[PDB]
Each structure stands twice: as structure tokens, then as C-alpha cells.
Symmetry: C5
């Protein structure tokens, strides 16, 4: 598995606008909401869960990276895998999107798979 | 268990106004005090204790996130489970509330379970 | 044991003004000096030692918290247990105070135990 | 092995201009892009992958340091070993370079190994 | 052993002017260069090697503290043990000094041992 796999999805030129931390079923998790830097489109929501999904090993790295980009407000590309989380209330609160990567973006391009 | 379980309680549009770090019964712990962003109402006090309670796995994540939100002074939703800590002197000084989640808040909504 | 036990001591309206990190007898340790925000009184010195004393488990959390408060210069309450460290050259350089807690302070009170 | 082995490669007076974090084959990894402070030449790309390659042990330290230099935008020397990552899509997106060290630089020299 | 042992060496009123991180023999390491704040004298170079020497336990604490003081440019006392590292090219690039402590130095005397 890889962040950049074409079965994952990404959204470019987003700003991380919200951050949530919690626990579910013995596992720390976090979620972020992102919106286009230019005001267009719909918000993206994705979560990472420390002990769940193939993406579990990168939990701490993604959490720290999300916090950094959140604190700066800079434009980023968010990589997700759709339809992972399954607890209905959790999905309805956030989304079924697993967060699988974060890339910095300049004006015209982002540094990461596309 | 989940941060968002309806048997937990939460308080929106709060600011983390104080932070304390200590140790109890072999465990580092931290407690926070939060107040309404607008200055109304009654302060909320919650603690997290390393290697104690079902919420233990999230101790470091919550500590890190509390320190961040404390340093920014931004509006947040605090999520707690009541009646967890039983050490009487500790409860008298702080409270029996376990901290179980933290969510950033815009002016219109908080990013988390409700 | 608890930070807030009446057998510990505390000092309010202090500011962390120095920080030292080192190692002794295979254990990382750090020490801080605090002084009254208003310049009065006598400095307080306390150290935490990673593998020693009943307070060992909170070493990392207190080091990080000390670093934070040292960086902001904000007024805090420092909690110690007296007469813990015993190596004479160490005590004479620093003190025998074990660091057992740190609380943020407001104008009129601090957020932490007090008798 | 060592960061400063002559079989490694280094690039001086670079600025870390982009940062990516992701996961591959069970391992979190990060990559950085660096560009000459003077605007010349071609960007250098290097990645570190947790628990992969002989450089695995230094993953966290390099991530932390890359984040630091990325945030300041100061000029550094980036040290890499070429031809380490072999996953073709990953290499195409980023490069085969393993990140093996970072050195700060003054205007006249960098603090790290050099031929 | 202790940072403050009289068999160690220390240098007061220094600042951390450079920082390098890398790996050697499967161990993360970092080195710092310090110079007198006032510009007199000659630089001191010291390194900490994560898996190596009696000082190994303090590696993360020293690296974290080194980063902090490097970022602020504030005065410090650096404590070292001489003639520890032995890999020749490494020693020639950096030094044989192991970093064994860091003390803040705002006050009249630095906050740390000075035997
Ligand atoms: C390994 C070693 O010798 N360490 C000693 C150091 C070094 O010799 C010195 O740092 C290298 O230049 O010197 C130490 O003592 C110095 C210290 O007490 C400082 C004040 O913190 O004073 C220095 O003398 C200065 C003094 O500040 C003024 O009189 C100035 O005008 O000149 C003199 C000498 O130039 C001391 O050398 C140290 O702590 O750095 C003691 C170490 O053991
Ligand atoms: C070990 C001890 O007695 N600690 C006292 C502390 C010290 O006596 C004092 O800080 C020495 O400088 O004093 C404490 O109470 C303080 C009052 O004495 C002071 O007049 O006002 C302070 C306002 O916060 C404070 O209330 C303290 O520092 O909290 C009490 C403590 O036990
Ligand atoms: C235990 C409890 O009462 N929770 C409720 C709180 C509190 O009444 C006030 O927030 C007190 O600050 O009010 C809410 O509107 C909120 O803050 O989001 C809904 C929430 O369910
Ligand atoms: C692989 C390689 O040749 N690295 C060399 C680089 C590059 O040629 C240029 O940096 C490319 O832009 O140049 C140096 O002067 C430098 O940066 O310190 C010496 C270094 O050995």
C-alpha cells in the first residue's frame, strides 16, 4: 500500500481549517476538516485512527504533520482513502475517509503524488 | 467507548484558561480549566492521567492537543466523562472528570460530536 | 503519592528563569530556577531525575512543561518535595528539591493544589 | 556506514522548500524538496522511510530536523545516499535518494562532512 | 558519572551557532558547534550518539535542549567529556567530545556545575 496509490483520492490547494482529537475503541484518533484556499468547493473531512486500518502505522506522523499545517494555515494537498471507517455515528459526525497523506503546495503545484 | 458517546458531556465555545501538570499514584497527569470564550457561565475542569482509566491510550495525544489549544487561546469544545477519578483530595482540588476529546470551534460550529 | 500532598511544598507567582539538562548515575535529569515575578524573595531551585525518587515517572511531562513555561515567561506555581537529592556537589550546585508539579497562575490565584 | 561517507552525496546552501508525509509498505515516510538558495541548479528530493534501509534508525530525528529547517527556511547542507528506494511509482513521484543527514550552514561553510 | 564531574570540561558564556544531525553505525547522532557569545576564543564542537557511551540515555533530552538553545541564540554553558568518539573521519569532521550537559546562562553565573 502507498499514499499515492491511484485507488486513493486527493484534494489540492486545501487549508486545514479544523482539528479534533479523541478516542474510540481503545484507540486514539484525530480528524481534520479542510477547505479550498480559494473558497470554492465543499469541505473535505478525514480521520486517522491509531490502531485501525492499514494506515495505522503512520498515525503519529500524520497527526504531527496535520497539527503543523493547521497551525500555519498553508495550502496543502490532502490524500485520503474513501469508505474506511464504519461506525455509523462516527462516520456521520466526521466521514468514512481515512487520512493517508499530507503534501505542501506552492501556487501552481503540490509536492506529492497526483 | 467513544469520545462522542452520548453518556459523555461536552462544553462548546470554551477557551483553555489554565494548565497543570503533576503526578499521582505513579502516573504523570494534567488538568485543564476552561471558560466560555465570551466570559459567561461556570468554568470546567478536566484531567487526564497516564496509564489510568479506559482513556489512558489517548493521554499523550490529549496532552499535546491541550497544550496547543492552551497556547493559542482559541475557542474549542471540551469533551469529558464524569465521575472517573476517585482519589478524594485530587477530586476536591480538580475534579473527577476525565478529559476524552478536544475540538476546534468556529463562530458557527464546533468540529466534533454533539 | 500526589503532587498536592501536604508533605510537599509550593511557591506561587514564580517565573522559570533558568534551565539545565544533564545526566547523573545513568539518569537524565533537569533542573530549573524560578524567581518571583515581582523580583522579591529568594530563588527556588528544583530538579527532576528520570530514574530516581518516587517522582521518576513524570520526568518527561514536567521537562516539557518546564520548557514551555520557561519559553513564555508566564507566572506559575512550582511544586516540590524538599530534601530528596543527596549527592552533595549536585545539591550545592542546584538543590535537594525534587520537582513534582507546575501550575499556571492568574493574577489572583493558581490552578493547582494548595493547603 | 556514516552520513559523511564519501560514497554518499551532499548539496550545500539549499533551502527545504516542500515537505510531504505519507505511508508505504507498512512504513510512515517523509520526503523533502530542496532548492539552491542562489536559485541555480535543479531541486534535490530525498525521503526517509521508517524501518526501511540502513538509515531506518534515524527516521524520527531526521523528520524532526527537516521540519525545523523547513519552518525557518534557512540554508542547509542536505546529505543523501543515492539509489536506495526502489518502489518505481514512489521513485517517479519523489526520488530514490535516502535522506541521511542535515547540516546548518553559515554563509561561508556548512557544519557537516564534506569531501 | 555526572555532567558536573571535575573530569569533564565546560565552557561558559557560549552560544550554539550550528547544528547537524546524521547517523553513524546504525545510531542517530547530532553535533553542535558553540562559540563565545562575545566572539573571543575558539569554537567548541561536541556530539551525542544515541546508542553509544554512558551518556546515551540523555540523547533525546540533549538534542531537544540543543535545538531550543540553537533556536533562541541565548547564552549557555556547554559541558563535554573529552576523547570519547573514535571513528577518525567523524572526529576530524566534528570532534571526540561527547556532549554531556547544557546550562542556561542569563544570570551572573550559568545555571549548572562549574568544578
Ligand atoms: C576546558 C576548560 O578549560 N574550561 C574552562 C573555561 C575555558 O577555559 C574557557 O571558557 C575557554 O575560553 O573557562 C571557564 O572559566 C571562565 C568563566 O569563569 C568566565 C565567566 O563565566 O570567565 C572567564 O575568564 C574571563 C572573564 O570572563 C573576564 O576576566 C574576561 O575579561 O577574561 C577572562 C579570561 O579571558 C573564565 O575563563 C569557563 O567557565 O568557561 C572555566 C572552565 O573550567
Ligand atoms: C514552603 C512555603 O511556605 N510556601 C508558601 C509560599 C512561600 O512562603 C512564599 O512563596 C515564599 O516566597 O507562600 C505561599 O503563599 C503566598 C503568600 O505567602 C503570599 O503573601 O502571597 C502569595 C500570592 O499567591 C501566596 O499566596 C505561596 O507561594 O503560594 C504559600 C506557600 O505554602
Ligand atoms: C453538560 C452540558 O450541559 N452540555 C451542554 C452544554 C452545557 O450546558 C453548556 O455548554 C455549559 O457550558 O451546552 C451545549 O450547548 C454546549 O456547550 O455545546 C450543549 C451541551 O450538550
Ligand atoms: C553530488 C555532488 O556532486 N555534490 C556536490 C555539489 C553539487 O555538485 C551541487 O551542489 C549541485 O547543485 O556541489 C558542492 O559544491 C556542494 O553543494 O557542496 C559539492 C558537492 O559534493
Amino acid at each position: 500500500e502507498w499514499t499515492g496509490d491511484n485507488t486513493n483520492a486527493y484534494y489540492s490547494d486545501e487549508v486545514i481549517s479544523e482539528l479534533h482529537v479523541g478516542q474510540i475503541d481503545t484507540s486514539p484518533y484525530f480528524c481534520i476538516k479542510t477547505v479550498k484556499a480559494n473558497g470554492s468547493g465543499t469541505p473535505v473531512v478525514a480521520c486517522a485512527v491509531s490502531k485501525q486500518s492499514i494506515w495505522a502505522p503512520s498515525f503519529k506522523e500524520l497527526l504531527d504533520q496535520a497539527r503543523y499545517f493547521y497551525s500555519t494555515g498553508q495550502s496543502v494537498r490532502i490524500h485520503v482513502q474513501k469508505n474506511i471507517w464504519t461506525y455509523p455515528l462516527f462516520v456521520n459526525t466526521f466521514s468514512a475517509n481515512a487520512l493517508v497523506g499530507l503534501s505542501s503546495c506552492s501556487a501552481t503545484q503540490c509536492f506529492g503524488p497526483k
